[PDB]
From a paper:
Since Giardia lacks oxidative phosphorylation and depends on glycolysis as its major ATP source, it has been proposed that disrupting this pathway could hinder the survival of the parasite; therefore, glycolytic enzymes have been considered potential pharmacological targets. C222 is at the end of loop 7, with its lateral chain positioned in a hydrophobic pocket formed mainly by carbon atoms of residues N218, G219, E223, F234, M248, and I251.
In all cases the final maps were of good quality, as indicated by inspection of double difference maps. The larger differences were observed in the region of residues 198-207, which corresponds to a small mobile loop in the middle of helix 6.
Numbering used by the authors:
A (entry chain A), B (entry chain A): 2 to 257
Write the structure that this text describes.
Amino acid sequence: PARRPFIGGNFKCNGSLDFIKSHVAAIAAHKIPDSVDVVIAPSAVHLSTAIAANTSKQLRIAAQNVYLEGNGAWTGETSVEMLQDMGLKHVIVGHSERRRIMGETDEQSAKKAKRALEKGMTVIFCVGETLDERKANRTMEVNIAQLEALGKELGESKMLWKEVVIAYEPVWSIGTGVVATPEQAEEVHVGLRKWFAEKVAAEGAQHIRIIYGGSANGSNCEKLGQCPNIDGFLVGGASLKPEFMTMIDILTKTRT
Amino acid sequence: PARRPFIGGNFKCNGSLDFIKSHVAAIAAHKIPDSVDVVIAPSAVHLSTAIAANTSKQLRIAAQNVYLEGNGAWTGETSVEMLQDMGLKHVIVGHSERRRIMGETDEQSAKKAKRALEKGMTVIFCVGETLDERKANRTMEVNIAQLEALGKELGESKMLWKEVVIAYEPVWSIGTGVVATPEQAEEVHVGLRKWFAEKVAAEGAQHIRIIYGGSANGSNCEKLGQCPNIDGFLVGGASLKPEFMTMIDILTKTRT
């Protein structure tokens, strides 16, 4: 059985008010089919501007991060409550920039995800290995460890996992212009799906979306989208460009 | 010679869209004199809502945090460029919640501050010791170390320091309802001003604002404001309440 395809655009720390207005309008003007989930994640200060600019009935706005506590004395942090008050359904958790550059631990990412999921959000949960870890032949060990941390907070819970979208982004592919080959990406996605079937649920493994990120763009996404276990993309740099819309079209054509 | 008094309200991780609209309107309706700087720092997702609600010609909106890189691949982070594009002049850097709970290092806080100052922002730079550090009689050593980290990035630079407001908030006073006595606070502020005179500039020490935070509220702020070296307040919990306006009035009456 199959999955609703998913494409997310992570703007990261980019944008101005004028850009958000113009780019969100451009995406919203694209004919987005009802058969694919399309989500964009502007920087936190731009979320309300993006929501106001979003005239699409399909496009959804997401956050790039959320904290693991509710409202309270957490200077600089955003709560799930704040995001839901703004009408958001989606949030990115555990992006490799936060894990590897900003010191977000496996347990911290897992706790953020659990809190968001328990409150009814859809979490795009990111995992991935560094070039060093892949050279050491620890690719699956690393990715599985990141997921087992979420598993520790959610276990086998049903429908905690229902609204998880796993995003595999090899760290060596992020912003480097070095995309994983379809073979390399599919191999990891197969491994993640086997892990899910074994440690969570066999039926659940058939339904969970596992998307690929890391230098995914309009030129390479068709071949990735043709891989049985790659349900779509988490797009960084290309999400700031008109080619993001081309990717939506390619994903639709290849997987619906 | 003397200082323009400064009062900042840090909302921390609190608020909904409706609250921001209503509370910013309430503050903006207060008669704020031209003689005092009054700044409020909503959560990042609420900044644009607060800016739209702010009809005051005196009140300024500030951010609670900013990253130490420009725009780029920093998922979950906000750049100085983004804040300036939104028209903001002020940012809180090095809040003790970020230092002590979220692992922001002295050097990281210093680098954030330097970047913001170089771009023309006013930085509310927070320092403070824990109860453990004070028990160990290391209060001044800790606070000075946090400032020397900024000094390392700015040195004796003129007018890098011109737009710094130092905020002393003993960690044991944050959200605990245990305010420092005027005697305790003034003693630290004297120490910080002596440090500034010795390590930065004697004339500069006469002009830099050093504000107190940590359970400051409408009931205790007059006695603090009467201390020669306490130029105002960084207000947490009370900034979410109507008593914030009472504090503005008390600060004006005591220091102008």
